[PDB]
Amino acid sequence: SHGLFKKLGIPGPTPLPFLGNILSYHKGFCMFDMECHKKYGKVWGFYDGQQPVLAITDPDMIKTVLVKECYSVFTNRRPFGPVGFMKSAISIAEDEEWKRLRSLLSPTFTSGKLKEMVPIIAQYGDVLVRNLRREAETGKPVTLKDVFGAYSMDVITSTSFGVNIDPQDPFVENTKKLLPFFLSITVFPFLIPILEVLNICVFPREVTNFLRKSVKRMKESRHRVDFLQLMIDSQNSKALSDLELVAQSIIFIFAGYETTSSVLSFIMYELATHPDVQQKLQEEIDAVLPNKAPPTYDTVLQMEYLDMVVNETLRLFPIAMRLERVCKKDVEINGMFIPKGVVVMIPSYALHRDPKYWTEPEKFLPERFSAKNADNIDPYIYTPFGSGPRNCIGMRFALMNMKLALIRVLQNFSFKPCKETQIPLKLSLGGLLQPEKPVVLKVESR
Amino acid sequence: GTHSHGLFKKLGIPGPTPLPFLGNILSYHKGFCMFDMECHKKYGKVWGFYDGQQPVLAITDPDMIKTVLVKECYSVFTNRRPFGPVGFMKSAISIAEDEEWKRLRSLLSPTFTSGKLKEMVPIIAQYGDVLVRNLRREAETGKPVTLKDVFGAYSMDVITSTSFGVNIDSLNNPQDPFVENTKKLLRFDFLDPFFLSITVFPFLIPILEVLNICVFPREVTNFLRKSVKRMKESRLHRVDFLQLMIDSQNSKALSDLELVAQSIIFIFAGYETTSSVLSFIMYELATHPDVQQKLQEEIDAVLPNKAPPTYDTVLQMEYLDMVVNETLRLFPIAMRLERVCKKDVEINGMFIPKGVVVMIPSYALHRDPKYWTEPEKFLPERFSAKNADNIDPYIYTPFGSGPRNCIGMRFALMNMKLALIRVLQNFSFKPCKETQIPLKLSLGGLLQPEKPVVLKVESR
Ligand code: HEM
Ligand code: HEM
Ligand SMILES: O=C(N[C@H](CS[C@H](Cc1ccccc1)C(=O)NCCCc1cccnc1)Cc1ccccc1)c1cccnc1
Ligand SMILES: O=C(N[C@H](CS[C@H](Cc1ccccc1)C(=O)NCCCc1cccnc1)Cc1ccccc1)c1cccnc1
């Protein structure tokens, strides 16, 4: 089965029997996608076990997969198992169960629902400053992902459920240990039904239990029309069950906690290593919001440099790393035959650092996204939230929540490196995009 | 154990209680046919069972059958039950799915047009003479005759010459390798725990596929795989089954491995199906001497002085069409028709979930007492033009129905009728006591007799 790309005439690294090219993952997905981008060119292919993966870098071809032929050919991502009751999650669902869930959860982040969350988020922005003030008045490096993670958890648990959870919170402790042996499912695709029909999962049964019974506890009502109320009103009318309702809550809680804090930690590292960017960003926040005025919905979208700082960080650190779609039937997009079953992959990390696009890609330059220069970026090359009908459904919520946190913090504190601050920042050579050592920074009050 | 074993309980559809893991496969000890017969009597028009964990919905309503086979073929009921491990034979037209089958069906449909079929009558007429002489040596002696052997040799010669233009069996050669390999090409026996465990535990399929394990034996596939490669003799044609695939190959297209996959399907179907039905027909003609005489009287009336059969005289013989149809009613060699419900639908007021296998019990419907008077009896008068109006084409489906019916139906009807004519022109058939009367069907997988059909041959 390892002679597919040889048949189609698509280049790529030579696969080993059974393993394929997974031995090249010792450096991580990022370095493997970048080495293959320079060694082979615009299009290459490799094998995750027996699964052929076609990597495309042409923006016209990326648009065809993500946007044009989404509902027809490239609808679902790579099959992930063994899951179990998590097969009904919107990020894992396929075809019609996804389309019905995509439509059900889309009204969660409209321009009106997002504008309702500003006063709710404004409460936790003050606790974020007070907790940073205690570690700033006393000389002590601050683990940013811990203090940012506690803020991100309270935001998503209130904007989606209205419940207040307020250092050893069992939600943060259980949500974080969804973080080895996946080397086997990449090589054993036939062992998925062995664990599926037998009811075996990858997620530990306790991180699911704590959340499965917490949603059944927050569901006690007795609102505000939030992420939980949208799923209850349709439940009281195919339809959603008490198990699928829990499956969506785990996705929103994990995405609101882990993705928000990790990007915020990456932003503060770039601001500390570039004091000229942090100082210039602080001057814009003070101008739009004088006297430390509370940030509102409209004042956030007004700040251009704040949007340029977030965009450049998401360019350097795209937490998704890759974009993937499963070719459901034989197609010939942009004059290139793609058989059914091939996983079409877009190397987002490798494309965000392509020298043939970004001048000095390893450099942190927020001026790439200025309105003078944001005309020279391709929306299918810079894809930190994906694209098409199956992009990030919470892109607008994530961008607003992180900017509200960056405003409230940069109004009161400046961030400097420490002795133990890992400069330059080393990315985790493992699976997900994270720093090797935790991000520690000195917090000086203003 | 269960997982799905509550589906038909949820839908209110009756059926036998399934055992954990096994489902209802324990009830297959009597075969497909006797199990479908008892279920149709016990549970009525619609019932469901479980081939392991696979829910199977059996339908008997002609309108609902028409919706599955004809109306909703391209949109819902396109593919058959997934059969594995097949390996490279996945590209076979009878096994292909979705667009691949759609491209193959259109590619192979011009094989059996009325023009192409009429061109085959002179070719078949040659082997009809060898069939008589081979039957004559055994006729001059009171020695019994195993009809599956002599009809299988005739069928193998017709399928190799009309599809590839190659003569392999030169008057026999009774040790011909094409017949020896096609014989053991596939043997679905419930006894063999292989096909048993495949149904009970289907997650073993991707294991055997990557293990290069195939339900078709290696030595049999190799013999046919290299024979087709040998069967390519161009430059040297005549536009047959092989030429239609060669011409489209020299223009996606069909690879030298898919071209072999279709040949194996046509070779087996032309050898096994034609010879089996011919043996079933001759058994009924011997056990009913009144039908055999009336058939011989019509053949002599249309073809006097043993005139050679032509494409038009075959379609003229009405009683010959009645005998072939009544035998196909009693012995539908497929037994069942199956389609996989690719998405949730509600046909004729009945919800069918995605993944359920909708099955049409052709054997049970052909013997349904609420349609056929004396269904177990061999009465060709059911198909007379006086009575053929009272026959629902969705109850009597020996070749299936819809876009994915038997693509070689008209070829099989012509090839068998061309054989019955030339045989009955020169011989009459009688039982032998060693002939199993009544004919017991094989309680195993496929529709076959227990003891082979043997008959006495008398010349005229
Ligand atoms: C900086 C923050 C975030 C980034 C960079 C990010 C990025 C992404 C990307 C690249 C995808 C896949 C897009 C594609 O395949 O085309 C995705 C999917 C998704 N994201 Fe996010 N995300 C972020 C935060 C969030 C948050 C806060 C939520 C809250 C609910 C969320 C919910 C989802 C969901 C549900 C999906 C799957 C949607 C679907 O498959 O239909 N994400 N995200
Ligand atoms: C008395 C002889 C035969 C009978 C009763 C018979 C019966 C059937 C039946 C019931 C089906 C399934 C129809 C359905 O599922 O709706 C079928 C399919 C098929 N038959 Fe036959 N058959 C016979 C001979 C032949 C011959 C001689 C060929 C030569 C090529 C052939 C080739 C096929 C093929 C290729 C299919 C699959 C059709 C598809 O998937 O499109 N059969 N047959
Ligand atoms: O990485 C694979 N699949 C991916 C994993 S699904 C994954 C399952 C899961 C993991 C951890 C905690 C809770 C649930 C999942 O729901 N995450 C989306 C939820 C959070 C998020 C993150 C980033 C952006 N927005 C949202 C599919 C995917 C969907 C959307 C964005 C990124 C990735 C993979 C790799 C090799 C072989 N097979 C599968
Ligand atoms: O019987 C199963 N599948 C069958 C598909 S495979 C089966 C595999 C095979 C066997 C022998 C030689 C070569 C290939 C196959 O190609 N035969 C059809 C080819 C010859 C034929 C027979 C009768 C009428 N015309 C044509 C269903 C079927 C389709 C079309 C016609 C007849 C039957 C089955 C049973 C249990 C579980 N799963 C599947």
Author numbering:
A (entry chain B): 29 to 194, 199 to 211, 218 to 260, 267 to 281, 288 to 496
B (entry chain A): 26 to 261, 267 to 281, 288 to 496
Task: Quote the study's own text.
In some cases, however, a partial loss of CYP3A4 activity can be beneficial, as it could slow down metabolism of co-administered drugs and increase their blood levels. This pharmacoenhancing (boosting) effect is currently utilized in anti-HIV and anti-HCV therapy, where a potent CYP3A4 inhibitor, ritonavir, or its derivative cobicistat is co-administered with antiviral drugs to prevent their quick metabolism and improve therapeutic efficiency.
The last two compounds in this series, 10a and 10b, had the head-group linked via the most optimal propyl spacer and the end-pyridine attached through a single or double amide bond. To overcome this problem, we used the same strategy and co-crystallized 10a,b with the CYP3A4 variant containing two surface mutations, K421A and K424A. The structures of 10a- and 10b-bound CYP3A4 were determined to 2.4 and 2.7 Å resolution, respectively. In 10a, the shorter tether disallowed the parallel stacking of the pyridine ring with the nearby Phe108 and Phe213. That 10a has a higher inhibitory potency could be due to the stronger heme coordination (Fe–N bond of 2.16 Å vs. 2.21 Å for 10b) and more favorable interactions mediated by R3. One distinctive feature that provided additional stabilization of the inhibitory complexes with 10a,b was the S–π interaction between the backbone sulfur atom and Phe108 ring (only 3.7 Å away). That 10a was a tighter binder but not a stronger inhibitor than 3a suggested, once again, that a small, chemically simple R3-group could improve the binding strength by establishing additional contacts with the protein residues, but could not feasibly diminish CYP3A4 activity due to its inability to effectively block the substrate channel and prevent access to the active site.
